[PDB]
Structure 1
Amino acid sequence: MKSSAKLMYGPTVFMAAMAVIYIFATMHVSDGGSVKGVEWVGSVALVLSAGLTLMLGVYLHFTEVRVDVLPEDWEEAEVADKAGTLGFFSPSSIWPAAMSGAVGFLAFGVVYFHYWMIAVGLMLLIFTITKLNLQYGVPKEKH
């Protein structure tokens, strides 16, 4: 995490510079072959594009300032240091494919713009999302 957090500051600096340059240039720089005025689409996109990298970079920096010296980021770590439980990872699940099909129903309901299709698509979507999130919580059957 430590190394990877610093990298987001290269793009942030560069895109902030290009945003300010683009803005005051497009409002200031004269030309024969082009009109003068602040070009808002590129402006907003460049500033929020710097904001994305600033967000993720400052978050990962604020995280790594309070993590131990893990064997992953340690140049001479032994394999045996990572022994123990690693984490829970889903062995299988049907609900991703069901969500894809639900989104498909919704999207087709938009292209045809039948409102019942949009309704049913949103219900299929929210139901399958709930079932994905509730996959490992379904209580044991009881009489």
Structure 2
Amino acid sequence: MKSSAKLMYGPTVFMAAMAVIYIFATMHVSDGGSVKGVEWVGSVALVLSAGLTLMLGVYLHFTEVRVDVLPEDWEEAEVADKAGTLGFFSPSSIWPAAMSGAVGFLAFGVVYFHYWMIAVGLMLLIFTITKLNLQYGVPKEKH
């Protein structure tokens, strides 16, 4: 991610430059095919659109400073250099499906605008998110 943190500056500076052009060009140019005055949707959502790229770019930049030369980031690396452990990946879980079902229940709750359905769907969602996180933590059954 040495180069990943860098390539975000491209879009960041581009969108920052376009946002400032947009604000100044929309509030001071009368075209005849529109009216004069700053547009408050293309300005806020394009200033803050550059914000996303800047955030991710800066975070990855700070992160990449304090990382050693990884084999994946090394041009002439042997396959045997990463020989070790790649951390912990969940093999299986039923909870993603359940919590999709829970968001579906809340969705229809909001559609029909039934208070009980919204309330149940909200707490049916908290439960499933909780169970997703506590999946590998459920203690050995104490008698």
TM interval, shorter chain, is over 0.9
- How many angstroms apart in 2 are the aligned matches of 1:45 and 1:110? 27
Can you list the C-alpha shifts for 1:14-68, whole angstroms capped at 9, x where unaligned?
A: 0000000000100011111110000000000000000000000000000001100
Percent identity over the alignment? 100
Task: Give the unaligned 5+ runs of structure 2.
Answer: none
TM-score, length of structure 2 as denominator length: 0.99
Deviation at 1:79, TM superposition (A): 0.4
Q: Secondary structure at the match of 2:31?
A: coil
Deviation at 1:100, TM superposition (A): 0.2
Match status 1:109 vs 2:109: yes
RMSD over aligned Cα, in angstroms? Answer: 0.5
- How many angstroms apart in 2 are the aligned matches of 1:90 and 1:20? 45
- How many angstroms apart in 2 are the aligned matches of 1:109 and 1:127? 17
Deviation at 1:99, TM superposition (A): 0.4
Q: Secondary structure at the match of 1:28?
A: coil
- How many angstroms apart in 2 are the aligned matches of 1:107 and 1:93? 23
- How many angstroms apart in 2 are the aligned matches of 1:110 and 1:95? 22
Can you list the C-alpha shifts for 1:110-134, whole angstroms capped at 9, x where unaligned?
A: 0000000000100110000000000
Q: Secondary structure at the match of 1:85?
A: coil
- How many angstroms apart in 1 are the aligned matches of 2:104 and 2:131? 17
TM-score, length of structure 1 as denominator length: 0.99
Q: Name the residue aligned to 1:46.
A: 46
Task: Count the aligned residue pairs.
Answer: 143
Deviation at 1:71, TM superposition (A): 0.2
- How many angstroms apart in 1 are the aligned matches of 2:106 and 2:83? 46
Report runs of 4+ in structure 1 exceeding 2 Å deviation: none
- How many angstroms apart in 2 are the aligned matches of 1:19 and 1:6? 21
Q: Name the residue aligned to 1:22.
A: 22
- How many angstroms apart in 2 are the aligned matches of 1:52 and 1:32? 34
